[PDB]
A paper describes a structure:
Members of the cyclin-dependent protein kinase (CDK) family have diverse cellular roles that include regulation of the cell cycle and transcription and, in certain cell types, differentiation (Lim and Kaldis, 2013, Malumbres, 2014, Morgan, 2007). CDKs share a conserved protein kinase domain that comprises a smaller N-terminal lobe linked through a hinge to a larger C-terminal fold (Endicott et al., 2012). All CDKs require binding to a cognate cyclin partner to remould the kinase fold from an inactive conformation to one capable of phospho-transfer. We have used biophysical measurements and X-ray crystallography to investigate the ATP-competitive inhibitor binding properties of cyclin-free and cyclin-bound CDK1 and CDK2.
Crystals of the CDK1-Cks2 complex were grown in the presence of each inhibitor. However, only two of the resolved structures contained unambiguous density for bound inhibitor. Dinaciclib binds to cyclin-free CDK1 through the core pyrazolo moiety, forming two hydrogen bonds with the main-chain NH and carbonyl of L83. The ethyl group pendant to the pyrazolo core is positioned up against F80, while the core is sandwiched between the two lobes through hydrophobic interactions with A31, V18, I10, V64, A145, and L135. The 2-hydroxyethyl group of the piperidine ring interacts with K33, which stabilizes D146 and potentially forms an intramolecular hydrogen bond with the pyrazolo core. Extending from the hinge toward the solvent-exposed selectivity surface, the Dinaciclib pyridine oxide group stacks up against the main chain of I10 through the face of the aromatic ring. Comparing the Dinaciclib-bound CDK1-Cks2 structure with that of apo CDK1-Cks2 we observe a slight, hydrophobicity-driven P loop movement toward the inhibitor, which results in a reduction of the active site volume, explaining the interactions we observe in the crystal structure. Dinaciclib proved to be the tightest binding inhibitor, with a measured Kd of 0.96 μM, while the binding of SU9516 did not reach saturation under these experimental conditions, implying a Kd greater than 20 μM. The relatively minor differences between the crystal structures of cyclin-free CDK1 and CDK2 bound to AZD5438 and Dinaciclib are hard to reconcile with the large differences in affinity observed in our biophysical studies.
Numbering used by the authors:
A (entry chain A): 1 to 157, 161 to 291
B (entry chain B): 5 to 74
Write the structure that this text describes.
Amino acid sequence: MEDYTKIEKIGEGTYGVVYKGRHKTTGQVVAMKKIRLESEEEGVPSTAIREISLLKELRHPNIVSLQDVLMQDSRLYLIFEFLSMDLKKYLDSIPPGQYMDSSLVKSYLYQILQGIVFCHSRRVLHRDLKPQNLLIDDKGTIKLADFGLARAFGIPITHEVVTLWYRSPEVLLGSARYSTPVDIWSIGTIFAELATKKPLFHGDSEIDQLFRIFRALGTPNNEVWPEVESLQDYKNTFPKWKPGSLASHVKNLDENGLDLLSKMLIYDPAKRISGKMALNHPYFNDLD
Amino acid sequence: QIYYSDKYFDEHYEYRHVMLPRELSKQVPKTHLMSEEEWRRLGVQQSLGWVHYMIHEPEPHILLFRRPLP
Ligand SMILES: CCc1cnn2c(NCc3ccc[n+](O)c3)cc(N3CCCC[C@H]3CCO)nc12
């Protein structure tokens, strides 16, 4: 669109390149996300652009607002509010020996849950939440980016090891369906990483990721997770670890923190805590 | 080239896995578990007693090995 000028490239994300940009009229600094659309079959439109319309209306303090959508043929720019930093890069920048203040952890988790609860209540999932996707301003606000886009684009069908660390066991074991609980799982893993500065489950592959999870939470079976032994990629030759062990991977977290974390990481997706319930958890009683 | 994970452990076995590059994995005829002779043809080098015990079907290029503890 002639209404914007690309200043510079700020990185590569799941959907491609993101530019820093400036709205010509208003001097509004923006983030512009280029998404390469396939040329499409005559008579057969995608429902991407309609799902995009929906997302364009969502406004909430803890989500990154999609301000505009610029179409070309076979190309699409998504315009967002710009933000000073991402959470991946911020955690890298904390010097070794320093941690994140435990009250900023709490604050960030809280806000992250507010964003997700807002999305979940509108039946919008993220599915690939990760520190790269969480953006901060210098005043204490944290926001979710890329909410809803996986449904918008994304197919029933690389080198994104990074992406595997926040992935749920229901997905990794090849369950037919997933729902909102995959985002609470992600949030679980990210909570640990806020506290410790490092990934809770640092897998090199899908199987290794599963193994890293089983090691900390115990290898599941029908008793702990009903009907898990029927999922396609469950094998009863997995290593046999016992229920963990999870508190040993996490430092800088008290009794309440550990409680909320273990509810975010329950195996059975039907019993894992919900976003609404997590916001009422006593871990947050001493927040504001 | 070939990648070797760190060892990890059960109460009963020790385990590792090994990641074949896309050229080398693409060649293997065998769809199922392999004997020590077979996985030695491929260039996997481990001590003796390592058993190919399972396949994670979503990642067939990953070979999962176990070996009992004392
Ligand atoms: C929603 C678009 C948006 C808005 N701000 N922002 C930021 N701002 C922080 C930043 C990073 C580096 C340099 N500077 O100056 C600022 C980063 C970022 N991403 C970081 C990784 C590359 C893709 C992408 C992830 C998915 O949003 N995306 C965005």
